[PDB]
Design an enzyme around this catalytic site. Sequence first.
Site, PDB file in Angstrom:
ATOM      1  N   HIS A 190       0.825  -1.206   0.000  1.00 22.24           N
ATOM      2  CA  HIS A 190       0.000   0.000   0.000  1.00 22.24           C
ATOM      3  C   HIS A 190       0.857   1.253   0.000  1.00 22.24           C
ATOM      4  O   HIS A 190       0.525   2.237  -0.666  1.00 22.24           O
ATOM      5  CB  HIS A 190      -0.905   0.026   1.228  1.00 22.24           C
ATOM      6  N   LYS A 210     -16.310  -7.047   7.071  1.00 19.93           N
ATOM      7  CA  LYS A 210     -15.070  -7.810   7.005  1.00 19.93           C
ATOM      8  C   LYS A 210     -14.541  -8.203   8.374  1.00 19.93           C
ATOM      9  O   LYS A 210     -13.558  -8.950   8.447  1.00 19.93           O
ATOM     10  CB  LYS A 210     -13.995  -7.014   6.259  1.00 19.93           C
ATOM     11  N   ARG A 222      -1.893  -5.780 -10.298  1.00 24.71           N
ATOM     12  CA  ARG A 222      -0.683  -6.574 -10.489  1.00 24.71           C
ATOM     13  C   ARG A 222      -1.052  -7.888 -11.160  1.00 24.71           C
ATOM     14  O   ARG A 222      -2.228  -8.217 -11.320  1.00 24.71           O
ATOM     15  CB  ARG A 222       0.023  -6.824  -9.157  1.00 24.71           C
ATOM     16  N   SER A 253      -2.597  -8.132   2.687  1.00 22.68           N
ATOM     17  CA  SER A 253      -2.930  -8.018   4.106  1.00 22.68           C
ATOM     18  C   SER A 253      -3.300  -9.380   4.688  1.00 22.68           C
ATOM     19  O   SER A 253      -2.871  -9.732   5.797  1.00 22.68           O
ATOM     20  CB  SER A 253      -4.097  -7.035   4.299  1.00 22.68           C
TER      21      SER A 253
END
Lengths: 160, 157, 157, 157, 160, 160
Positions: free
Chosen positions: B17, B41, B90, B128
């Site tokens: 990040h 979440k 990515r 993460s």
Amino acid sequence: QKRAIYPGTFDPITNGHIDIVTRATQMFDHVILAIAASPSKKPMFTLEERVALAQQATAHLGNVEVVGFSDLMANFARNQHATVLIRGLRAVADFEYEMQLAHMNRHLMPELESVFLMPSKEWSFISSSLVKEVARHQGDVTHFLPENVHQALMAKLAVD
Amino acid sequence: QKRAIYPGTFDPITNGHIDIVTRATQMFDHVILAIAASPSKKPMFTLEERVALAQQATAHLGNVEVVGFSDLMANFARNQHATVLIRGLRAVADFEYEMQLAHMNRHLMPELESVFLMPSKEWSFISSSLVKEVARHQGDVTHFLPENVHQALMAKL
Amino acid sequence: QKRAIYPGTFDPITNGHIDIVTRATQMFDHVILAIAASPSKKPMFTLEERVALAQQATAHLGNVEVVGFSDLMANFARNQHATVLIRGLRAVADFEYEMQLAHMNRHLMPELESVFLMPSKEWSFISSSLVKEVARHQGDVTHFLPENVHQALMAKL
Amino acid sequence: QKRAIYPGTFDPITNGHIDIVTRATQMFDHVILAIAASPSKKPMFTLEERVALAQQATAHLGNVEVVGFSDLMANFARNQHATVLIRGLRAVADFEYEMQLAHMNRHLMPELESVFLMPSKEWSFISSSLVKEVARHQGDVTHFLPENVHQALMAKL
Amino acid sequence: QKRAIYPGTFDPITNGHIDIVTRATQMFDHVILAIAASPSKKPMFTLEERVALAQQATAHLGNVEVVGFSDLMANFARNQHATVLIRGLRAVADFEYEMQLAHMNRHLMPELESVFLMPSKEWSFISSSLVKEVARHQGDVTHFLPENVHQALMAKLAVD
Amino acid sequence: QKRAIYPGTFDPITNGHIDIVTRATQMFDHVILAIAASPSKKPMFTLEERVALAQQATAHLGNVEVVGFSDLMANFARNQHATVLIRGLRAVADFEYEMQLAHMNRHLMPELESVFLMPSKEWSFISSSLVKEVARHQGDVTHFLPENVHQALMAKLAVD
């Protein structure tokens, strides 16, 4: 301020490319729409024709300049002092190839930042190669092209 | 002044990040790193914790402003006068889901243009979630995290 | 003696897993089938149950040793003197996630080399999760499971 | 009479689902829109609610019959005398998972032929999950839903 | 014990291939780096050049033998008694094509087990075809190549 | 009732194609297996040979008619009054290309509905291009082909 380059073969420029370059000009101060000669691909349109078609199709976008180049894209971008490299990213993209190219270009010119923009849903699904194949086989592709490109493609196929 | 928003759950912020937001600041005058509460979440860190961690980790990036929000991201972006929406991208990315999200965001605020940036190869595989799984087993993740984030992860666990 | 580890949740072991571990034993002298406790997945079977099921299902593979573990897989692999990490791979695989996991595993133990093997076409679409979903509706999954595993699934349900 | 089944959780039915079932009716004489109870997904709407919403949303499609079911989909399909299994498919789809599901369905009922249909570009990025996430933040999702479904979503929230 | 074959066109061998063959030799007792003639691809380097370059670049790896072959890979692997087939798997791979090839090779020679190894992050993103395209268009690709291959590519492009 | 078209180059027809057309005939009343001339691909078999091979291989399927066409597929489908367009979808497919083609065909002829069918596990992994490459390089591909196609391919390669 920021000089962005939007490179490709643009053979010919399509509505999807118009979409992307329009988004790029809303984001960056100056955008060079850069047309690679690409003789190995045996383009349907000459570089002069592709530049002329792209010029006409982007005439309404004040901060777009169309220019042809025959060198490595990164070598051209460096000499033109571009710092942003515009790429389109859509549903049918060869995503891994685009990642290959972005990593190679970062190796060649780390000061040139790849950025990916996404076109409207309308232009998410059709490649320019399929447009040409369909037109050459007598299908209707007018929907995908600026009017000037439509006229040029009709003439190119009529005499071909 | 071109204003960009870089939103996410940042639970916690990682070196990937930091790479993305740093690339964003080289392009755009002001970048808002915007942390969504994301209660669905069930995040490891509270929103205040995540904001504090990201503030410290970006303290030396003068054009980054860290904020928290609990409302619709598109409304928050409009209310911050952002016109660029930063997304990471990515080779390992589920890019089709990123396309779905970008189209929903565009439906909600067409003036907010999604822009995908690519992190350094060093951070081309981190997440993460993977960091947290290794840390839950006391594995060494210091390579992947700002120092302040590593400490906080050690305390939560 | 080349020592390979084949780790996973094995909840429960399926005929696809048997295929992979069998291919691994044709290549490597000793294969450790290593079952992670995986509490964050809330597994259907306890670790002791999963180990017992995999022991019976592999009883006739003389070079397979079934163990359970609850620590970091990379540390367990080092502690078992493994230098090869067996992963399954097939056309339906989320291979980019497998790449992320392999890079994290390599960061934690660079001497442990990930090696991806491809199962038989017969098992090219099966998964533990899909088997469990069909079994929850009393569908016939005997084709996909060792007999001992089929019985245990019938009892848990 | 060729009988097709279009099964799913439909929690809730969206304009994408309406598009798919409409395409199915142009091809097949009778289409059963079959709503699975799906308790493991902890759906937002009860089964009776989902059936009622889908009934209203398809009321003007004369060859669509909406039903609910809680058993194995393949058994329900056999019991409805269906021989075609309608699945949606688009550029953003996890098509390999759709392949896994189709192979499991074929193992359970080989006479039930999976057939994948492609929605309109307008619905090429929508999902039930994304609609619900935006609605949880009071975002305007009226574009994506039958009117009766929009009302019910506003009441549940 | 185990004889592994690592086949490809190796046109030319790159640092990513060096990475993969190094991992393979740490895992298997003997590795044949096998170079397919591949005339249909019109390789940049002749088979003799490719073998020589690969030999020099792997000279430090004691259990690697470089050999060229012009038959079907599986027919060569069978006659050489290989039982392990080394494939590279990286982020930008055409994954489904690799699955096609592994299934076809299992059909042809079931006693030859495909195994996939993953290169370092550094070599995860760049194909040898892009390396050649970039070099031919005057870009810097030294980073991706062993020094002997760098020298050979410079000479090949200079005279081409 | 429903007239379905199952188009492709069928160069040559394989067991996977037989699988798909068999599923299509169980679903739709009449299926046209339509073979595109495709001269740009330089097919291994002439259109006449491909039609003859497909006719023999589908002779047991009463509601299949094999016919060659040299126009745009959508133009042929329209003149033949097809309303269903059969596509195969399998594990190794270029999925995004198939989505491109379905969107283009919907643009050209919205009354022609693309439907995707999935072959058996046995035929999920191998392209006809790989079958031809393997056969030309002296590998065994009999498993993938109807017996009549096996015989024709052996003869084609023997004289080639």
